[PDB]
Amino acid sequence: DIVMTQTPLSLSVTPGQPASISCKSSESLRQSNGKTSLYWYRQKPGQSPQLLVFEVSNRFSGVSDRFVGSGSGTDFTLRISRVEAEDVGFYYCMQSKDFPLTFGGGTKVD
Amino acid sequence: AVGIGAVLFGFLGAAGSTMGAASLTLTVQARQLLSGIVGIKQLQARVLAVERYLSDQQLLGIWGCSGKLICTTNVPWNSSWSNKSQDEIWNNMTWLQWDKEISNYTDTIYYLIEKSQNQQEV
Amino acid sequence: AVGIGAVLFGFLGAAGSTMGAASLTLTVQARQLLSGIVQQQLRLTVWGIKQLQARVLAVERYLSDQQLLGIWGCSGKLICTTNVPWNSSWSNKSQDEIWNNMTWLQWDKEISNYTDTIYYLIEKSQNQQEVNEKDLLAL
Amino acid sequence: LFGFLGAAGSTMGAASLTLTVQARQLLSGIVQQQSNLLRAIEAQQHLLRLTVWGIKQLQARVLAVERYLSDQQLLGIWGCSGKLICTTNVPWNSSWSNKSQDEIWNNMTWLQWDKEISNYTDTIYYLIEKSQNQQEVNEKDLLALD
Amino acid sequence: NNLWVTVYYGVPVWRDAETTLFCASDATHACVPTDPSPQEIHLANVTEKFDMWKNSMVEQMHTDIISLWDESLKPCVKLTPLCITLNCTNITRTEEGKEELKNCSFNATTELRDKIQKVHSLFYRLDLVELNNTSMYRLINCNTSAITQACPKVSFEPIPIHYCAPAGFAILKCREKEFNGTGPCKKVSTVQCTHGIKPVVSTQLLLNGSLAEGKVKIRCENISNNAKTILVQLTTPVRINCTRPSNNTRTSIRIGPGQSFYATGDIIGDIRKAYCNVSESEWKEALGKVVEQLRNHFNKTITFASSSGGDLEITTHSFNCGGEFFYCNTSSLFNSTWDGNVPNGTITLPCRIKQIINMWQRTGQAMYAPPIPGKIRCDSNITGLILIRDGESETFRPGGGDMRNNWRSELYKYKVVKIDPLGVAPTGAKRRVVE
Amino acid sequence: LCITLNCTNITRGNLTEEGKEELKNCSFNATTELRDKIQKVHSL
Numbered sequence: 001d002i003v004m005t006q007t008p009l010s011l012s013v014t015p016g017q018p019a020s021i022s023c024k025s026s027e028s029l030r031q032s033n034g035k036t037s038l039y040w041y042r043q044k045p046g047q048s049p050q051l052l053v054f055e056v057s058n059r060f061s062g063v064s065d066r067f068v069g070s071g072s073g074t075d076f077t078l079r080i081s082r083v084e085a086e087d088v089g090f091y092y093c094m095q096s097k098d099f100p101l102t103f104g105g106g107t108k109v110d
Numbered sequence: 111a112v113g114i115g116a117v118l119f120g121f122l123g124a125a126g127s128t129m130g131a132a133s134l135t136l137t138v139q140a141r142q143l144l145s146g147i148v149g150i151k152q153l154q155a156r157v158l159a160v161e162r163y164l165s166d167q168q169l170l171g172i173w174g175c176s177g178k179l180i181c182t183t184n185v186p187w188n189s190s191w192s193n194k195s196q197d198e199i200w201n202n203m204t205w206l207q208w209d210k211e212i213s214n215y216t217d218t219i220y221y222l223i224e225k226s227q228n229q230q231e232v
Numbered sequence: 233a234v235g236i237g238a239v240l241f242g243f244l245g246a247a248g249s250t251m252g253a254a255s256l257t258l259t260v261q262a263r264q265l266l267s268g269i270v271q272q273q274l275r276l277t278v279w280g281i282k283q284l285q286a287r288v289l290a291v292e293r294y295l296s297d298q299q300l301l302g303i304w305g306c307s308g309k310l311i312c313t314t315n316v317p318w319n320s321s322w323s324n325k326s327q328d329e330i331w332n333n334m335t336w337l338q339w340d341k342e343i344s345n346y347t348d349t350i351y352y353l354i355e356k357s358q359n360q361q362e363v364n365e366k367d368l369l370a371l
Numbered sequence: 372l373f374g375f376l377g378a379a380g381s382t383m384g385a386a387s388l389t390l391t392v393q394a395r396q397l398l399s400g401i402v403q404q405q406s407n408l409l410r411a412i413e414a415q416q417h418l419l420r421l422t423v424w425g426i427k428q429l430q431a432r433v434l435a436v437e438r439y440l441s442d443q444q445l446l447g448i449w450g451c452s453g454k455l456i457c458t459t460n461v462p463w464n465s466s467w468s469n470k471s472q473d474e475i476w477n478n479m480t481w482l483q484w485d486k487e488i489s490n491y492t493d494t495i496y497y498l499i500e501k502s503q504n505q506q507e508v509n510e511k512d513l514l515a516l517d
Numbered sequence: 518n519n520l521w522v523t524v525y526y527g528v529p530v531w532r533d534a535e536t537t538l539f540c541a542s543d544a545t546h547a548c549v550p551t552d553p554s555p556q557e558i559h560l561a562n563v564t565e566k567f568d569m570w571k572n573s574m575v576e577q578m579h580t581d582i583i584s585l586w587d588e589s590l591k592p593c594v595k596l597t598p599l600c601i602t603l604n605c606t607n608i609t610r611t612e613e614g615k616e617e618l619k620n621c622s623f624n625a626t627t628e629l630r631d632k633i634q635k636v637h638s639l640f641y642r643l644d645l646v647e648l649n650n651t652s653m654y655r656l657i658n659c660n661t662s663a664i665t666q667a668c669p670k671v672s673f674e675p676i677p678i679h680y681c682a683p684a685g686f687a688i689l690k691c692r693e694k695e696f697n698g699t700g701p702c703k704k705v706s707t708v709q710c711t712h713g714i715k716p717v718v719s720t721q722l723l724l725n726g727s728l729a730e731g732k733v734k735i736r737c738e739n740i741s742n743n744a745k746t747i748l749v750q751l752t753t754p755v756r757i758n759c760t761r762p763s764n765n766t767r768t769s770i771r772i773g774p775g776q777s778f779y780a781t782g783d784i785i786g787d788i789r790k791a792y793c794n795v796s797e798s799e800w801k802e803a804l805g806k807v808v809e810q811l812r813n814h815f816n817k818t819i820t821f822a823s824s825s826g827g828d829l830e831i832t833t834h835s836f837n838c839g840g841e842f843f844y845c846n847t848s849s850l851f852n853s854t855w856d857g858n859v860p861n862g863t864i865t866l867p868c869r870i871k872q873i874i875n876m877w878q879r880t881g882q883a884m885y886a887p888p889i890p891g892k893i894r895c896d897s898n899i900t901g902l903i904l905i906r907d908g909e910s911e912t913f914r915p916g917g918g919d920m921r922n923n924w925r926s927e928l929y930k931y932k933v934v935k936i937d938p939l940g941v942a943p944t945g946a947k948r949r950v951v952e
Numbered sequence: 953l954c955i956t957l958n959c960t961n962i963t964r965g966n967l968t969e970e971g972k973e974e975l976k977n978c979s980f981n982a983t984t985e986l987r988d989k990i991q992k993v994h995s996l
């Protein structure tokens with residue numbers, strides 16, 4: 001089993017400054033295809049989550065430019081810039097390199 | 111994430127089964143004699159890999175056995191080579207044990223398979 | 233001073249023709265697979281090793297497909313027939329739809345996920361046939 | 372005439388009766404026959420330096436492999452796979468040679484035929500590969516007819 | 518009826534041969550940085566005895582690691598302009614480390630040619646030779662060698678190495694748990710490549726190795742008497758903590774055009790010696806597991822001696838962590854007596870360090886390991902022993918000899934075979950048809 | 953060795969020495985292992 005840990009528990013309330021968050025991997029998630037497994041989601045409280053990041057520094061369609069996630073090897077980040085709206089949600093990562101599929105831990109957004 | 115579907119004949123696999131059931135998996139091990147999982151000594155490794163393969167293909171061409179897995183020659187089996195019955199060979203014996211049984215008599219049999227091809231005179 | 237005489241078929245000249253008239257030119261590509269321009273009419277140069285590596289590669293790829301023909305029932309031939317029935321989950325297309333309408337390199341991009349499954353079944357029915365041709369010679 | 376290349380000098384009617392002598396030295400006795408190439412490898416393992424005679428054994432092996440496979444491929448594209456005298460359906464064009472059979476088979480060697488027909492063999496090989504390819508197409512859909 | 522010969526091609530028969538496997542790596546001039554995912558095919562009903570002490574993979578892997586170590590010293594700096602009469606004196610400033618250092622000054626060559634640079638550095642007494650308190654010294658191997666400085670950007674970290682099988686060959690592996698090293702198995706399996714094997718270069722104690730996962734395994738080689746080595750597998754890993762408690766300033770001196778010498782500038786503060794702690798309760802627990810397993814192979818009383826005084830590479834505990842080479846004194850781990858049928862405390866091991874190191878038991882190719890800035894701290898598991906027998910009683914000493922005994926302890930699972938694909942058998946009434 | 957050589961004849965009842973005028977007795981400052989030390993040798 002591979003464990004994913006994200007350190008900040010919530011988000012700062014100010015819509016001016018962007019505060020980047022990050023996950024950490026217990027094992028390197030590079031798969032033998034030459035591709036990684038780290039994702040990033042947003043579960044709005046009351047609604048289903050949605051995809052935001054399908055690979056490290058790759059952005060899903062219909063997603064604003066604030067959402068971008070870098071990472072090299074086992075270290076991983078999520079760069080955040082130009083906080084544009086009050087789109088609340090629950091942030092958590094994904095280990096999809098093996099089984100079982102383990103997510104992050106949750107991070108509230110307000 | 112990678113699952114595992116159906117399972118077919120692996121590489122050695124039938125190495126411990128009997129010689130009646132190991133002669134249905136002959137194509138699996140013939141694929142691996144040349145390909146492999148592969149700067150002047152980088153080339154001498156490759157040329158030996160080619161010439162170990164072509165040495166066994168030319169020897170099958172000396173005989174009648176070119177381009178087939180099971181072939182048949184008209185050399186009689188001398189009953190002093192091994193005198194075992196047909197059911198205790200093809201149903202009660204592996205290929206690793208039969209290889210140790212006639213390891214003495216290998217150069218004698220190859221010399222007769224080659225001679226009976228020069229005695230075609232056709 | 234030269235000049236172009238009469239012309240014949242050439243290398244890859246039936247690529248993108250069709251599938252039934254590009255199989256009338258199989259020997260034209262099969263002639264250019266082993267010997268190239270490397271063979272013409274003082275040691276360890278950069279261009280010397282790079283020429284020698286091109287000659288060891290050209291034998292390894294040729295023997296790869298030539299091995300795979302002999303494991304099947306098809307050695308020394310250009311068109312051979314097998315006993316493996318075609319499975320429509322591999323491709324469902326019609327007989328007049330891949331012949332006379334499709335070309336190769338369009339059929340190549342269609343069944344390239346299924347060739348490893350197809351290759352296993354040709355080899356399996358060759359073991360089953362050669363044991364039976366042995367066991368028919370015991371009467 | 373028995374012995375390697377001993378029929379060089381005889382006429383090609385009698386030089387073609389002993390073709391087994393040549394197609395055994397050139398199929399068996401080339402790569403399968405020698406095991407002393409891997410007795411010189413350990414002697415190259417004793418010395419720690421790549422010598423001049425180690426390079427020349429690469430170039431004499433890669434010339435030996437290519438000379439073997441570029442005569443078996445060419446016999447594979449044609450219908451003449453594992454045999455020494457084979458017939459084809461290609462009619463002999465008299466503009467290749469107008470010469471009679473008694474002059475060819477009984478007053479001319481093979482080495483005098485090399486120096487007469489060599490400008491024409493690239494044209495002749497095209498017509499053997501083309502007629503072999505037309506044959507196997509015809510015996511496939513004939514096969515599928517019944 | 519008669520009985521006829523047939524020839525089958527593609528037959529599952531292997532013989533035991535020797536070849537050259539190719540080095541992979543978990544991802545230079547000798548290895549291939551592709552990272553494979555190997556597979557394993559569990560066989561059935563085959564035994565295939567191994568004889569671990571006659572294994573060709575150990576001779577090849579010893580050859581390749583020497584080849585990797587020499588390859589990373591070819592673009593490095595030759596140090597033959599630094600063989601001068603040095604002018605060495607004692608350092609004057611926890612003050613029990615000034616005896617083993619000097620403060621040597623020497624005339625050097627510079628970026629130009631007609632002028633002379635006067636510089637200084639702090640060497641060790643193990644890296645100096647008296648020539649004919651201020652007196653004139655000389656380095657170790659001006660006499661025999663051309664010393665080469667190790668390039669500072671190249672770390673000495675053990676990076677794991679897979680060995681994969683070529684065309685026509687295979688690699689076998691006993692799946693079972695309690696395997697003595699030699700003799701037949703019942704559970705073997707074919708792999709594409711080995712597991713990741715870390716090149717831990719160490720003497721007298723196996724560091725960061727694998728584990729027994731059984732009781733305790735010990736394996737002695739079976740020449741006429743076993744007066745040579747014996748390898749303990751040591752289930753529970755005893756943990757050792759090794760450190761050097763002194764910061765180091767590293768000054769760089771330009772010897773020539775485009776090349777410079779990284780020397781030792783100054784000691785800031787204390788000069789306390791380098792050492793290693795060993796947990797005493799876990800070590801004496803560990804020797805109790807070893808001594809009962811040795812009774813099943815000798816059945817006498819079992820005492821542990823120490824290596825007699827001599828050279829450093831044959832007596833002391835040699836390892837590498839942090840980029841420097843610790844030579845640690847293991848006399849306080851190996852005296853005991855076990856006459857047939859919880860300790861409070863820790864153990865202090867004295868450790869000396871050297872910089873001109875001559876590795877792989879070979880003359881002519883010494884290496885100046887550069888100094889490391891900062892305070893080195895390092896942790897490692899003791900997972901094995903290398904013991905030697907001297908022969909009532911029987912005494913044991915710390916092992917020595919080649920570095921290949923580090924690779925019997927890893928490659929004991931594996932075996933390389935060669936596949937002979939032709940095979941003949943009597944067939945039946947199957948004779949070749951007449952035409 | 954490509955240096956100036958301080959080279960002179962050999963200081964050696966008639967047939968016991970014949971080819972004196974082919975050999976000479978050269979001497980020169982040669983280097984050694986230690987970079988600051990110089991040494992003389994007396995090669996023929």
Ligand SMILES: *[C@@H]1O[C@H](CO)[C@@H](O[C@@H]2O[C@H](CO)[C@@H](O[C@@H]3O[C@H](CO[C@H]4O[C@H](CO)[C@@H](O)[C@H](O)[C@@H]4O)[C@@H](O)[C@H](O[C@H]4O[C@H](CO)[C@@H](O)[C@H](O)[C@@H]4O[C@H]4O[C@H](CO)[C@@H](O)[C@H](O)[C@@H]4O)[C@@H]3O)[C@H](O)[C@H]2NC(C)=O)[C@H](O)[C@H]1NC(C)=O
Pocket residue numbers: 669672674675717719724725836837838839889890891894895896897898
């Ligand atoms: C048996 O197995 C154990 C387990 O792996 C092994 O212990 C580990 O050894 C490695 C040796 O590579 C140790 O790695 C070193 O760690 C130190 C400390 O890192 C910690 O602290 C920093 C700062 O607080 C944290 O950021 C970090 O995450 C760790 O928590 C590092 O300082 C070392 O880095 C230097 O060396 C690397 C390799 O050259 C460089 O990539 C790196 O950038 C650093 O070099 C730079 O700085 C130097 C000055 O500090 C300078 O001199 C250089 O020129 C360069 O500019 C290094 O990563 C690891 O910590 C050990 N772990 C434990 C638990 O002990 C044993 O070594 C092994 N034993 C044997 C005998 O094989």
Ligand SMILES: *[C@@H]1O[C@H](CO)[C@@H](O[C@@H]2O[C@H](CO)[C@@H](O)[C@H](O)[C@H]2NC(C)=O)[C@H](O)[C@H]1NC(C)=O
Pocket residue numbers: 123124126127128561562
């Ligand atoms: C390993 O040996 C066992 C011996 O029992 C094989 O199992 C038997 O094989 C015979 C062969 O015809 C069958 O008739 C029996 O029914 C098998 N027994 C069982 C319980 O299935 C086994 O097949 C061998 N392994 C392999 C891979 O062939």
Ligand SMILES: *[C@@H]1O[C@H](CO)[C@@H](O[C@@H]2O[C@H](CO)[C@@H](O)[C@H](O)[C@H]2NC(C)=O)[C@H](O)[C@H]1NC(C)=O
Pocket residue numbers: 188189190191
């Ligand atoms: C079958 O094998 C037997 C082996 O016992 C052969 O008989 C012996 O062959 C050797 C070698 O040629 C001779 O030195 C012996 O004198 C032979 N024994 C006798 C009693 O003569 C035998 O030749 C082989 N072939 C046949 C057809 O039986």
Ligand SMILES: *[C@@H]1O[C@H](CO)[C@@H](O[C@@H]2O[C@H](CO)[C@@H](O)[C@H](O)[C@H]2NC(C)=O)[C@H](O)[C@H]1NC(C)=O
Pocket residue numbers: 604605606622651
């Ligand atoms: C290098 O060695 C020389 C002598 O071989 C030292 O020179 C003198 O040493 C005495 C000893 O106390 C001093 O009193 C003099 O002042 C020194 N003279 C000079 C010109 O240095 C010299 O000290 C040594 N160098 C070092 C760095 O120890």
Ligand SMILES: *[C@@H]1O[C@H](CO)[C@@H](O[C@@H]2O[C@H](CO)[C@@H](O)[C@H](O)[C@H]2NC(C)=O)[C@H](O)[C@H]1NC(C)=O
Pocket residue numbers: 601602603604622623624
């Ligand atoms: C470095 O070079 C200097 C200069 O060549 C050396 O100084 C000489 O030391 C001796 C010993 O006392 C004196 O007799 C000379 O007069 C000094 N020379 C000059 C020009 O002052 C010095 O000894 C050398 N040091 C080393 C370690 O090689």
Ligand SMILES: *[C@@H]1O[C@H](CO)[C@@H](O[C@@H]2O[C@H](CO)[C@@H](O)[C@H](O)[C@H]2NC(C)=O)[C@H](O)[C@H]1NC(C)=O
Pocket residue numbers: 608609620637639782783784
């Ligand atoms: C080794 O000796 C040298 C020279 O004796 C020391 O360099 C001296 O350092 C002090 C403190 O910075 C200066 O005041 C002197 O002027 C230096 N002398 C020279 C000639 O440069 C050096 O500090 C000594 N190293 C240690 C570790 O004690």
Ligand SMILES: *[C@@H]1O[C@H](CO)[C@@H](O[C@@H]2O[C@H](CO)[C@@H](O)[C@H](O)[C@H]2NC(C)=O)[C@H](O)[C@H]1NC(C)=O
Pocket residue numbers: 756757758794795796863864896
């Ligand atoms: C060797 O180092 C380990 C750390 O790797 C030490 O283990 C620590 O022991 C203290 C006891 O005072 C605990 O509080 C820590 O939690 C332990 N750390 C870990 C990571 O387990 C060990 O004590 C050291 N042993 C010696 C003899 O120095």
Ligand SMILES: *[C@@H]1O[C@H](CO)[C@@H](O[C@@H]2O[C@H](CO)[C@@H](O)[C@H](O)[C@H]2NC(C)=O)[C@H](O)[C@H]1NC(C)=O
Pocket residue numbers: 825826846848849867
């Ligand atoms: C370090 O090792 C040395 C020998 O390698 C040990 O030195 C011996 O110490 C005992 C202690 O009583 C003396 O009786 C011996 O005479 C010493 N040996 C020699 C050759 O003189 C030393 O004890 C070890 N260090 C520690 C801390 O045990």
Ligand SMILES: *[C@@H]1O[C@H](CO)[C@@H](O[C@@H]2O[C@H](CO)[C@@H](O)[C@H](O)[C@H]2NC(C)=O)[C@H](O)[C@H]1NC(C)=O
Pocket residue numbers: 848849852
């Ligand atoms: C074994 O090593 C120890 C130290 O490494 C030697 O010194 C003994 O140390 C213990 C420590 O508790 C003392 O109780 C003993 O009295 C010491 N021995 C003597 C003779 O005083 C010891 O000498 C070594 N040898 C033996 C046989 O124990």
Ligand SMILES: *[C@@H]1O[C@H](CO)[C@@H](O[C@@H]2O[C@H](CO)[C@@H](O)[C@H](O)[C@H]2NC(C)=O)[C@H](O)[C@H]1NC(C)=O
Pocket residue numbers: 792794863864865
């Ligand atoms: C083993 O290492 C530890 C730390 O690495 C040393 O522990 C220190 O011991 C001194 C007194 O001996 C204390 O004043 C320190 O507070 C300890 N360190 C810590 C972090 O608590 C220990 O001395 C070492 N064992 C030796 C040298 O035998």
Ligand SMILES: *[C@@H]1O[C@H](CO)[C@@H](O[C@@H]2O[C@H](CO)[C@@H](O)[C@H](O)[C@H]2NC(C)=O)[C@H](O)[C@H]1NC(C)=O
Pocket residue numbers: 958979
């Ligand atoms: C090097 O050459 C010089 C002359 O250029 C030699 O000097 C004199 O040689 C004569 C001949 O033996 C001696 O009698 C003198 O005593 C030498 N002069 C001095 C000042 O010694 C010198 O001998 C030559 N070197 C050698 C080794 O022969």
Ligand SMILES: *[C@@H]1O[C@H](CO)[C@@H](O[C@@H]2O[C@H](CO)[C@@H](O)[C@H](O)[C@H]2NC(C)=O)[C@H](O)[C@H]1NC(C)=O
Pocket residue numbers: 956957958979980981
């Ligand atoms: C070897 O080096 C010595 C260095 O002293 C040379 O000796 C000097 O040579 C010069 C030039 O002839 C004389 O002026 C000096 O008087 C000599 N010094 C002494 C102490 O004799 C010597 O000539 C060199 N030898 C050779 C063969 O070049």
Ligand SMILES: *[C@@H]1O[C@H](CO[C@@H]2O[C@@H](C)[C@@H](O)[C@@H](O)[C@@H]2O)[C@@H](O)[C@H](O)[C@H]1NC(C)=O
Pocket residue numbers: 646647648649660661
């Ligand atoms: C190498 O050094 C050995 C040890 O002797 C040391 O070096 C000599 C030159 C003297 O300075 C002596 O006082 C030293 O202790 C010698 O035995 C050996 O001959 C030297 N040479 C070689 C080629 O090994």
Ligand SMILES: *[C@@H]1O[C@H](CO)[C@@H](O)[C@H](O)[C@H]1NC(C)=O
Pocket residue numbers: 193
């Ligand atoms: C076959 O030969 C062996 C040894 O030559 C002999 O022991 C055995 O009895 C023979 N078999 C029969 C059926 O006689």
Ligand SMILES: *[C@@H]1O[C@H](CO)[C@@H](O)[C@H](O)[C@H]1NC(C)=O
Pocket residue numbers: 202
């Ligand atoms: C042959 O089969 C019998 C059982 O039918 C078995 O007892 C015997 O061990 C087998 N032969 C060998 C050599 O194993």
Ligand SMILES: *[C@@H]1O[C@H](CO)[C@@H](O)[C@H](O)[C@H]1NC(C)=O
Pocket residue numbers: 210211212214
């Ligand atoms: C093969 O011959 C050797 C003598 O060279 C003999 O010891 C051995 O028993 C023979 N093999 C068999 C299976 O009998």
